[model samples]
Target: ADLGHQTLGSNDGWGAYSTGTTGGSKASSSNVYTVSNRNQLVSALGKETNTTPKIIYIKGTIDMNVDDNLKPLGLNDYKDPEYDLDKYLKAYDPSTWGKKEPSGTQEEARARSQKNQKARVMVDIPANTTIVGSGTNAKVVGGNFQIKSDNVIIRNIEFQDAYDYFPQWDPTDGSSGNWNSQYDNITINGGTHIWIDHCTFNDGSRPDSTSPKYYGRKYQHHDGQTDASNGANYITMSYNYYHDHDKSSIFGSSDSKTSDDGKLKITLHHNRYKNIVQAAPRVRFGQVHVYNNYYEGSTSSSSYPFSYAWGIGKSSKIYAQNNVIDVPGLSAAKTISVFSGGTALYDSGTLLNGTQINASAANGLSSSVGWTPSLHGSIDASANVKSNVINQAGAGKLN
Candidate 1:
């Protein structure tokens, strides 16, 4: 209401809150409308409501094509602190963006400046519209927010520095859990259906030098742990590449209080998880069906370096089958289980339902290799998947 049709980037989380009048007559039933802005879009969608329901269209674009300061030491130009950039350029000057200076001191200053230049995009998206990224490279990264705002769709974007997105002034202090939680990306608060296809997400933002172990490490304060708002519902995240982002991908359904009426029905398939270290995809609360996806670890991914995923609240409608786990080296103690308490079945006689999810049971392993993160429990013909048995039951279909 205050700010007029605001324009925002990943750096600013708050989006525009707008309103207008679109007059029409009963005779003029045929009207083709397109709403781009967040708030206004919501108003438009609210106007057209019937039992059968209708359709809404939206287009969005955040940003495109940035640069990487340190592009690998040996492969690209050695931008390391040790390499003397001033020594390389004959006409070396300390001030300009690239004055050809190759000295260690100059290099340090340049690197520092570059680090400061790299910024993050934060967004507070709206409802009933599809946001399409104009440029293939755009992003939004923030904290303590909600995603579900009725009905919305998002596409082609990235996220960076998300700490500052949370509202600072706490009107409702002490009780931090229920504070100003705004779902930035594409929240499906109470929407009937949603589709998040052909998208990419990563903590892929460049690291910060002044902050010590910067980009590689993500640490948030008081409200940092808060999850996005787009609560449990029907959703689909497919054909995407997720990286850099640590455990906070979701704080979704599965953890219900008492009345078991509404929960999320999620289907995460045909996606790739790279460099992500720790996270429980099917936790918090909801009915999740995770199958046919690739989850692998990188040398520097911190999401699950030492923690495990899965195992939170209780939900009867949870299923994990037919997913390929590419994580190579692991310790048994810190295993990431699909079902933490214990799997529904672990057929020792033979494979469960004639399935086998085993790696190597022949292990007299030393205590040192114990943190290999495990699955819910042990399968009959199990694969030594660090802690729990692996896809020994293979991929099973539940009726």
Candidate 2:
């Protein structure tokens, strides 16, 4: 266990978090593999088994650009052109869909979609495995890393340029049609006892607002930086930096409303959100513990920059305490927002420029759930956040 005690939440709420699980060959180097590319990383994952754990050591940059393999119809398969995307989501418009026409394609657009899917650098984290980077500089580029197994640890890795080239256009994302950006830096889909510590997630070249508009919308090439969905339970996300993406860290996909009950339990503490657009960990249905995190919204970096700091939705029981925010010109009410039908929020000790905020009244909260988070430290004074968080939070070499 040379990784030492990352201690769950620290680095003044920065760096990798300790998941308290022996991820990927814990305490033993029996099944060790060193990787520096997507192919090598896949090989390392293949070596994992229930009884035989594995440790994957990442070094240098792992860039992903999937090979072009032709499909049935003699069509060139690769990144789907914007024209195809626009044709698929025919009715999608900017005003109704919130932005503009997003990049999209048909459900059976197999060649383009499959080509882009292969192009996406994917890492299927195996059960009982630890994937640690060389250091702060060790990076993963254009990866669609998925964690679907239990007892996994990912630490000290910088995930960059994970843009889902294929944006799906769904006609029924509301009354109006909308385009859903594909892929995130990390997706925890149906995993348990996982820890993601000290990771940096962002688009390398495609910033949310700045990217060119294809179809009409701002060409949202990237979705979430780190998203946990599909009943992912007992996970800890600490010391990570998320920025420049519109839909940042959504807890649950708007799927299976009845199935997502009491499942997605997460602990997010001591992270830094800088210039990020929305979903600084938006919730659906879970006991989400958000505390000691720092949030700063952008003024003009995006066309749809800075809507709501905290988006509490549908049966989400959020215990958000001691978080700090300073989105310029934004009212306190918009800081902690409550979506319609979202219930059960217990919040206190939040700060905005040395003032204690009334989250319940400001966000128009009429009901309060009787739930408290027992797994957290004391709240820091609001005035002390800018000093504490700015200097320390995010991915890098930890003390």
Give the Cα RMSD of candidate 2: 5.0
Clashes within 3 Å, all models in order: 60, 13
TM-score for each predicted model, relative to the true structure: 0.47, 0.83
> Which stretches in model 1 have alpha-carbon errors above 4 Å?
1-127, 138-147, 165-192, 204-218, 221-231, 251-256, 259-262, 298-306, 309-312, 331-335, 338-399
lDDT per residue for candidate 1 within 189-214, as digits (tens), equals 44433445445554334321222221
The reply for model 2, stretches above 4 Å from the true place, is 4-20, 25-27, 47-51, 67-107, 110-120, 171-176, 377-379
> What is the model-wide C-alpha lDDT for candidate 1?
0.34
At residue 75, what lDDT does model 1 achieve? Answer: 10
**How would you encode candidate 2's per-residue C-alpha lDDT over 1-399 as one tens digit per residue?**
444322333321211224445675443555787788767777677733543567778888877654423122211345345435555445345444544434334445633565556544566777877788875577888788888887777888888867655665544555655456667788989877777877788787656555665444454567778888888887778777776667778887774564777777788877788877788878888778888888887555434477766778877878787888877777777776677668566777777655788676676674365556555556666666666776666666552
Candidate of highest lDDT: 2
